[PDB]
């Protein structure tokens, strides 16, 4: 949580779903895609330092990949971890 | 009517799981045979 | 197991032969007995699992001589 | 180590374009080359709205086997074979006839 090297690989991408848009408008919560092995703590430190924003709490969930077919071949989407990071009141990104 | 297979993951892993098979040499010989045959799924563990 | 610690005698297998010469597999085991031999140099009793043939060789060879061979064999008396 | 390079001038040895001269454009790893405006084929290109909306009968160059073309001497006016030679420690190509370095 304290190493700048660990933090720079924790955040993978922002989530741009309809739920994420509602989160921007209603509860000032940012939805991110993080490393599958990441813990709520380190994620709070990385966002606080790399975005200069105050974080209230971070809840995480694991999304199970979907099973799809490419032609006649079976395949599976990868599992990923979704983090709901709630920013302190007032601050905006 | 109650059919023969009543699934249970804990029972399934404790009976035929990788660690149950490898506990004894005879089970380890099962793994050797399945490795020689080239099985994609060595044991029943997920 | 049933192995003599001096001579190394171990169970062997053979045939029960009847009057009709029927052969059935059997085992011959050594006449093993646990005995406490008095070793004078250490003023101690050391217990060994020996056969009756092993007991005879201990008298002939001396208690100290056999133990020296045992240490070379690494039998951990 | 390749006898035919990107900018070489060649003459077609076999096919419907026998005797025609052209300039190589692309050398494909499959042992085929694309020559500028030689082996024209009319491809029925389906229209794509995202880009190149108007699809019509399009004339483009098709790949030709390297064995089916030969380098053009441009001095004797005939097809020639390529050899290799070390001149100043660098391997260069020369025409088999009249053995002059390219």
């Amino acid at each position: 949580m304290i190493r700048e090297e660990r933090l720079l690989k924790v955040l993978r991408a922002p989530h741009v779903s309809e739920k994420a848009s509602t989160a921007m408008e209603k509860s000032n919560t940012i939805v991110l895609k993080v490393a599958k092995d990441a813990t709520k703590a380190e994620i709070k430190a990385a966002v606080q330092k790399l975005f200069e924003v105050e974080v209230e709490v971070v809840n995480t969930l694991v999304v199970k990949g979907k099973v799809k077919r490419h032609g006649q071949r079976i395949g599976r989407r990868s599992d990923w971890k979704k983090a709901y990071v709630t920013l302190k009141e007032g601050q905006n990104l | 009517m109650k059919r023969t297979f009543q699934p249970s993951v804990l029972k399934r892993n404790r009976s035929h799981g990788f660690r149950a098979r490898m506990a004894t040499k005879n089970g380890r010989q099962v793994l050797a045979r399945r490795r020689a045959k080239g099985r994609a799924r060595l044991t029943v563990s997920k | 197991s049933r192995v003599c610690q001096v001579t190394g005698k171990r169970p062997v297998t053979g045939n029960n032969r009847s009057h009709a010469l029927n052969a059935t597999k059997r085992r011959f085991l050594p006449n093993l007995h646990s005995h406490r031999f008095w070793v004078e140099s250490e003023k101690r009793f050391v217990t060994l699992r020996v056969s009756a043939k092993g007991m005879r060789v201990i008298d002939k060879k001396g208690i100290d001589t056999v133990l020296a061979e045992l240490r070379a064999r690494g039998e951990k008396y | 180590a390749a006898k035919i390079r990107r900018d070489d001038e060649v003459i077609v040895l076999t096919g419907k374009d026998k005797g025609k001269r052209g300039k190589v454009k692309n050398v494909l790893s499959s042992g085929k080359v694309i020559v500028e405006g030689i082996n024209l084929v009319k491809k029925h290109q389906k229209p794509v709205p995202a880009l190149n909306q108007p699809g019509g009968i399009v004339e483009k160059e098709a790949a030709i086997q390297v064995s089916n073309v030969a380098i053009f001497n441009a001095a004797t006016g005939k097809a020639d074979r390529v050899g290799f030679r070390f001149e100043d420690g660098k391997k260069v190509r020369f025409f088999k006839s009249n053995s002059e370095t390219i």
Binding site: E4, E5, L8, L11, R12, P14, L50 | - | - | -
Partner: protein, 63 residues
């Protein structure tokens, strides 16, 4: 040339270079996901450079 210059310097300069190099990679990853990055070849470039600098660091660390 890049590898040569890396070795020439010292550990401290290299560490500053690694952190700076990684920072554009993190920035590039964000632009890539947001659809704002049109020059996609830098993503592979910085990844190789990160590997190159770390390789020189191990070489210059005695072992």
């Amino acid at each position: 040339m890049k590898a040569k210059e890396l070795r020439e310097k010292s550990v401290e300069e290299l560490n500053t270079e690694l952190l700076n190099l990684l920072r554009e990679q993190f920035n590039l990853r964000m632009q890539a996901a947001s659809g704002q990055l049109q020059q996609s070849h830098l993503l592979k470039q910085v990844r190789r450079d990160v590997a190159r600098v770390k390789t020189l660091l191990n070489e210059k660390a005695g072992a």
